[model samples]
Target: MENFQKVEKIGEGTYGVVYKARNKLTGEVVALKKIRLDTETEGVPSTAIREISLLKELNHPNIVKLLDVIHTENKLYLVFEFLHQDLKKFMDASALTGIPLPLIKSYLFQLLQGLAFCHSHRVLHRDLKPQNLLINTEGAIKLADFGLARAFGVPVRTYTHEVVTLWYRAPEILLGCKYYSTAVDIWSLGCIFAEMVTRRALFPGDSEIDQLFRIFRTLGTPDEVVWPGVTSMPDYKPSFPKWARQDFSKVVPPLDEDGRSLLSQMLHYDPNKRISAKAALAHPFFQDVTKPVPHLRL
Candidate 1:
């Protein structure tokens, strides 16, 4: 930790505080996250342990690089390749003027590509929002913050409901379904894709009920026909208002038919039917994005 000079505290979260720093010898810029270990009995937090273990194994251009891990007498420091800012900040700045179609496509593609890599490794990023997506000046996008991520295998595991952020959470998760998969991340990607085009949150619900209602009103309430085991979820409500499916064009006007189609697949009511990150990469919406643009570097 002494090898780097701290520039300033950039942000703080449930896990720890993050700072911008520069290596003394190599002069390479990095983001240093200080993990808090307030109690000796508990040792390192499980979130920190999961993040370190998963990040060490996963490596991709679209995923943030874990440069090194530093352990001192009382604390731990995680070193990551520094990024200029996050997609949330970038979106906020361009919210009024609206994001360019090419840039939106580029960012969305990079996000899915990173997720595809994670899914390929049997890892699921339970919490994926624009705020966690880091962006560089060169227009490169990288998925960051894996504190809530978990690795899943063939046995089929059940996870807690308190995972993803309210608005970006998938319907099955919100309904308290424990046996979710990478489809949760795809749902978040759908929300992000819509936000990138509209420059606003698609479903900004104030509470869990509000969130579920918001989703139902937007995509229509799901039944056994739409989601086979949806009624069996622990928290599934039988009395929720039934809503008709909304028109994609009215919600995200900037998106064309192909883009809307891709978004629909990603936000499917059934987790089993939700588009996989790898499959989403091959969608028609991204067909025109194969050729690289000199100005926008992926």
Candidate 2:
């Protein structure tokens, strides 16, 4: 067909069936991602279109590389670099044998540089979590699954699309503020960072409302004084529980003072006040960290 021949059919997994394929000329094995269209006239999904173009533009060391694209009238296939596991699987095993501090810094640094690159180019990786991060045997990491991301303009607007889960959700988003931006991803980054250190979900949530409560339980509820702007959110209420906030040292016990400072800025309540990914890279918390991939304990 496209000079790319199927080598063998692997077991069905992840989103759907997976196949080990190779370029006939080079004999290099590749992962095949296929999509079927409901109708031929639709051409392709806008989500796929966004993914292709974004991958086209965001080809980076830390961003998942798109090798090739192939399609027929009713089907589409994407050729990607073969990688063994996602961060979710890697982190799960990490709970048994904890990840070292330097390793955490290295991975977080990898993520920030990739995210910083995306934001600088006006793209927001709205979906960022352990599951979306791919890892190879060499402990190399790359951001994946740009299906929920979109390019943004200077002025922010309301977003009505449904995001995946509440574990990494931002407080502003949970409160029904449709107007969100890059800050949302930073909040997710903080949650991911905490998870890496603690080897568990920082905010163990069961529902959208409970997610907010979990956040409030740790970070303290916002009030009219410090959080003067949240009253404008769509889900604003006159009475809110005045639960106290816990210091990051206690919540993420393994983290040091500098790490806690980084988390605070990353998970800032107000979207506008949250630290930009680029700025996060420059934070002194990484002064001793070597921003390169290290051999993971897996």
Candidate 3:
């Protein structure tokens, strides 16, 4: 604590308080998250442990860098590279103006790139909402808040239903499918992509049932024919209303044909059918984006 000077408290959550701080020696600005370890009997929270272990292994331009971890007697402090704001905050400021299409594509592309990296490493970022995405003035987007992330390698595994936030949670997770995969994160990316353009949540449901209803209403209630084995899901509701799929063009007015096409693939009801991050990066929606020039060219 003495090596860094606290600028101000930037964030507060159930886990701990985040302070904007400056490293005294290097004068580098950073975010310091002080984990709450009041319960000595419990030791470090599983979330903190998971985050520390995973962040150490994940290194990418679009993933938040975990600079260092410090332990003092009975507390833990995680140091992360600082960014100006999160996607949520940026969207809030641009509510009226709306995010530009090119920028939206760029952000989404970077997001998918990061996810592809994670997926290749067999890591699943269970939480992928706007608030969990950090942004900088240079228009760089980085995935953050890996407290809910888990590495999935086993062919058969059980994961808790209480993972992603309500709006961004995938249908399989909502249906209480204990065995899930990378598709969960793709579903969340779909929700976020729509929100970025609309500057409002696509499914702002009040409860779990309401959330499921919102998704079904927008995409239509799935049957065994459409979703194959949806009826077998642990929490599958037999009486869910049979709503027809709404026009996505009207739903996401800002998106073009290519954007909407990718969105649909990502938000598919069946996890098996959902687009993978690597596949998504090759979609036509990003054809217009210019690739980085090689060093030799420079």
Candidate 4:
């Protein structure tokens, strides 16, 4: 903390206020996240601790780097590799009115590659949204904000149903299932895929029930065979009086056949039935991936 000077406040993040800081020694740019230690019993804020520990074990071109951490008095500071902008900002600046399919494929491919690495290490990024995905100056994508990340796969492990941003949350979680896995991430990936194409979130719900209904109307209600025990979920309940089936053409009319196919796989009702991140990277959607490996100068 003493080695850097805060230039200005960037914005409020999931955990705390972020600032543009400069390292005194190297004169390099860095983003500093200042944790809110107002709650005494929360134990250093789970998001901060998660980011610190998770970043230590996972490193890849598509993942934001945790350069350092500093603890002073009652505050925790996270130093991260700075980037000029995020995907959202890039999308805005690039005039995302009608983004090309190839460009979308490239971005999705990078996201899957990063997620594949995290999955390989048995880590689940409970939260995966466009805001959490970063874009550097070189047009390379990187997954950021590990605040909700956690290691999974231990038998009988219990997770909070509170995971995932509501828009990207999976149906199982929305139904109050406590035992979950990386498949939750696949649900979010699907939401992101749809969002990128529509330039808007497909399901913008006001409540849990609303969210489920929105999904059901678009993708059709999952049955016992497609999603066993779905009815037994803790929060499972009947939604609106009627149900409708998915019409892919109407959902994402702009996307090509390959793009729609990829979206369908990523948004599978059965988490286990969804395509793995590795398989997604190797899908035909990425057949023209000119640079499978991302490069970032900043």
lDDT of 4 by residue, 194-224 (tens): 7777777878788878898898888888877
TM-score of each: 0.94, 0.91, 0.94, 0.90
Candidate 1: tens digits of C-alpha lDDT, residues 182-214: 898999999999998888899999988999999
lDDT of 1: 0.86
Task: Encode model 3's per-residue lDDT on 1-298: one tens digit a residue.
Answer: 7899999988894367899999999999999999866844688888888899988899999999999999877789999999888888778877777777888888899999999999998888888999899888767789999887887787435565447778898888778877769998999999999998888899988988899999999999999988998998888878878999999998999888999999999998889999999999999999997432111100
lDDT values for all models: 0.86, 0.81, 0.86, 0.78
How good is model 2 by TM-score?
0.91
Worst 10 residues of 3 by lDDT: 289-298
lDDT string for model 2 (221-244, tens) is 887665767877778675778788
Residue-pair clashes per candidate: 0, 0, 0, 0
TM-score of 1: 0.94
- The residue pairs found clashing in candidate 4 are none
lDDT for model 2, on a 0 to 1 scale?
Answer: 0.81
Q: What lDDT is reached at residue 213 by model 2?
A: 84
